[PDB]
């Protein structure tokens, strides 16, 4: 087996392979998550350097880990599949031994642990992936949104964004999200999510993806149809 | 270049510079000799006294292998000990299977193949010692000298360390001026003298003399240390000859 220490410390006290993994995330298509008062919404930019795509069969950018938790990501698509697979196995393993689905915090802490392990294991590079993990703890109606990054640190967010031009939309959400007043309705939360992407996303075309997670394993993804209705509405609210 | 940074790399001459660098650590060490006699061998070594805080008699450098084999070495002492520990495993394993204690030529090749093996890979360092060893087997006496390359031959006499050149020249004298043979007790005195003569080059500090011998008549074919009286006799013989 290949033993080489690829993630090591530099004289300034930095791990360059971890910091370079974040550069791969920076390049990744933009992803955003917003906590409603009784929902969470995951928004995802999808680059339009290519059309002639088939979108029935192309990997969707939000993945179900269990029936009550979803995971979006920014960075290397191939790397994300390995984290998603491990998380889905751990979710079924938790149900099998504890007789309860994972809490969002637990599932986050697991994925974060996997990411960290690859920052001080021989013969491996860190994951070129940051993740937004969203959902509801079993028999709980309080919404959960967590972020993980290649280093393995994780934390809870009222709302957060990752990937290319994320600094732009984090500045938007910081300006447009009151913690004292979270988006009360589903539509309200979905609107604020699309708005933040439209700072960055170019057109309202098949460029935006929205997935909405409600309590008790109530997860549904919007079709272009229903997102266009927000894109159309916010555009006509710019008339000041 | 770059040819000398990795062990087991051939230079464009056809040399292994890391083995040649190992030899420098040997040359840097204290003087050690072997004298092959009539029915045995004698080993002697120069022990530099850093301080009168060294307990005399108590930092022994000559090592026995099995019961009939003496080993002495110059250079990196730990490397020598590690080689003797291997020699002991090799001699125990030989005895276990074949019942007879390991012949000296057979034993020499066991160290030979092991030392040579540390010139085959960049993941190990060559041995920082030249090892003078031998004893009495069923075919009489054998003296051997082994170098970091894995090269070894049988010797009439042999020397290594700082005083190797004076010793080498003093050994050559004996081979000429005693062609029919040197006795065990003779070789003990001669050994003591040659260590004192070769102390010329480590003149800086004064030293402690250590002799061992393996003679068919004098030690019954077993390796014993020359202690107490016969030691002081050879020390006195040597003091007389540096006058």
């Amino acid at each position: 087996g290949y033993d080489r220490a690829l993630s090591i410390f530099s004289p300034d006290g930095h791990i360059f392979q971890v910091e370079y993994a974040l550069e791969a995330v920076k390049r990744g298509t933009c992803a955003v998550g917003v906590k409603g008062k009784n929902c969470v919404v995951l928004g995802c930019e999808r680059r339009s350097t290519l059309k002639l795509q088939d979108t029935r069969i192309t990997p969707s950018k939000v993945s179900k880990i269990d029936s009550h938790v979803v995971l979006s990501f920014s960075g290397l698509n191939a790397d994300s599949r390995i984290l998603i697979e491990k998380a889905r196995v751990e979710a079924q393993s938790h149900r099998l031994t504890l007789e309860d689905p994972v809490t969002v915090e637990y599932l986050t802490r697991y994925v974060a642990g996997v990411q960290q392990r690859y920052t001080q294991s021989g013969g491996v590079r860190p994951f070129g992936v940051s993740t937004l993990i969203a959902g509801f703890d079993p028999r709980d109606d309080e919404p959960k949104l967590y972020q993980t990054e290649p280093s393995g640190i994780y934390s809870s967010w009222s709302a957060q964004t990752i990937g290319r031009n994320s600094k732009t939309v984090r500045e938007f959400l910081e300006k447009n999200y009151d913690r004292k007043e979270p988006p009360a309705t589903v539509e309200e939360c979905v609107k604020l999510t699309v708005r933040s992407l439209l700072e960055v996303v170019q057109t309202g075309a098949k460029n935006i993806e929205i997935t909405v997670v409600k309590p008790d394993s109530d997860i549904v993804a919007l079709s272009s149809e229903e997102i266009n209705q927000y894109v159309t509405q916010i555009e006509q609210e710019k008339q000041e | 270049t770059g040819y000398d940074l990795s062990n087991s790399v051939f230079s464009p001459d056809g040399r292994n510079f890391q083995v040649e660098y190992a030899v420098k650590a040997v040359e840097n060490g204290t003087t050690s000799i072997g004298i092959k006699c009539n029915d045995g061998v004698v080993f002697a070594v120069e022990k530099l006294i850093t301080s009168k805080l060294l307990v005399p008699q108590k930092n022994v450098k000559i090592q026995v292998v099995d019961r009939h084999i003496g080993c002495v070495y110059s250079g990196l002492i730990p490397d020598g000990r590690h080689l003797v520990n291997r020699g002991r495993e090799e001699a125990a394993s030989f005895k276990k299977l074949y019942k007879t204690p390991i012949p000296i030529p057979a034993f020499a090749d066991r160290l030979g193949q092991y030392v040579q093996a540390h010139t085959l890979y960049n993941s190990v360092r060559p041995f920082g010692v030249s090892t003078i060893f031998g004893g009495v087997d069923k075919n009489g006496a054998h003296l051997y000298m082994l170098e970091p390359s894995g090269s070894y031959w049988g010797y009439k006499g042999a020397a290594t360390g700082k005083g190797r050149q004076s010793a080498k020249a003093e050994l050559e004298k004996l081979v000429d001026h005693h062609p029919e043979g040197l006795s065990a007790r003779e070789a003990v005195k001669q050994a003591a003298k040659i260590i004192y003569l070769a102390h010329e080059d480590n003149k800086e500090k004064d030293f402690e003399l250590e002799i061992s011998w393996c003679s068919l008549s004098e030690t019954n074919g077993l390796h014993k240390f020359v202690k107490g009286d016969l030691l002081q006799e050879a020390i006195d013989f040597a003091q007389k000859e540096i006058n």
Binding site: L52, L76 | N122
Partner: protein, 244 residues
């Protein structure tokens, strides 16, 4: 030690790219162009060979188009040898699924496992990645006809029409231009050839430099036939479409 001679095939550039993946992709860009086009009633695979010599055995040959099972085929672009390692893996993986579930493997599941293998070689093991891009043409009873590509990175995506290998920028523009969703198989066959005709790096596009395969609905209804074209059939379809 041995660290001195290690290239580190699985590290990031300061820009967060995988050196070896990027250089492998560069390698594939010099390989004979392969095209996949998906119709409403089937899929076409077309591939150009690296400039053939007239003494090269024409008929009994398949360096670009390989069969995975009865319902899935791939077009290769890159090192043939690297591709055959991955193909035999995929063929086994398909047979494992069939033995386990007594059902033919869904096209995506096969594509995902092959992509997950490639991915591994980019994240651990300190080995070079596989210098291979695949176009997967297959049918299953969930999504019907499917076109995929995978590249040395372990990334895979779905396509209505796609090219890999040389002059893909040129080829992707020509396909994007003349492709429509209602398009039938025989139209897709004609498009595939027209595209290679325009993007080939020699003057004549003759039958002897082409491998061709179709996955058709055409059979005894409900079942799927998989056709790797004999050289005479490629000569016929080249005369039919009036390129020779």
């Amino acid at each position: 030690g041995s660290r001195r001679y290690d290239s580190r095939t699985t590290i990031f550039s300061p820009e967060g790219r995988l050196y070896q993946v990027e250089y492998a992709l560069e390698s594939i860009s010099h390989a004979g162009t392969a095209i996949g086009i998906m119709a409403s009633d089937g899929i076409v695979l077309a591939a150009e060979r690296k400039v053939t010599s007239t003494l090269l055995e024409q008929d009994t040959s398949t360096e670009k188009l390989y069969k995975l099972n009865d319902k899935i085929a791939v077009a290769v672009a890159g090192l043939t040898a690297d591709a055959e390692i991955l193909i035999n893996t995929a063929r086994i993986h398909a047979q494992n699924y069939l033995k386990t579930y007594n059902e033919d493997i869904p096209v995506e599941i096969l594509v995902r496992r092959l992509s997950d293998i490639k991915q591994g070689y980019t994240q651990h093991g300190g080995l070079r990645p596989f210098g291979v891009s695949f176009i997967y043409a297959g049918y299953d009873d969930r999504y019907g006809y499917q076109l995929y590509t995978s590249n040395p990175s372990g990334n895979y995506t779905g396509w209505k029409a796609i090219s890999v290998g040389a002059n893909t920028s040129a080829a992707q523009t020509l396909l994007q231009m003349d492709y429509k969703d209602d398009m039938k198989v025989d139209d897709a066959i004609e498009l595939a050839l027209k595209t290679l005709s325009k993007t080939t790096d020699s003057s004549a596009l003759t039958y002897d430099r082409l491998e061709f395969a179709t996955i058709r609905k055409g059979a005894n209804d409900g079942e799927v036939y998989q056709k790797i074209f004999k050289p005479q059939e490629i000569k016929d379809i080249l005369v039919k479409t009036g390129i020779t």
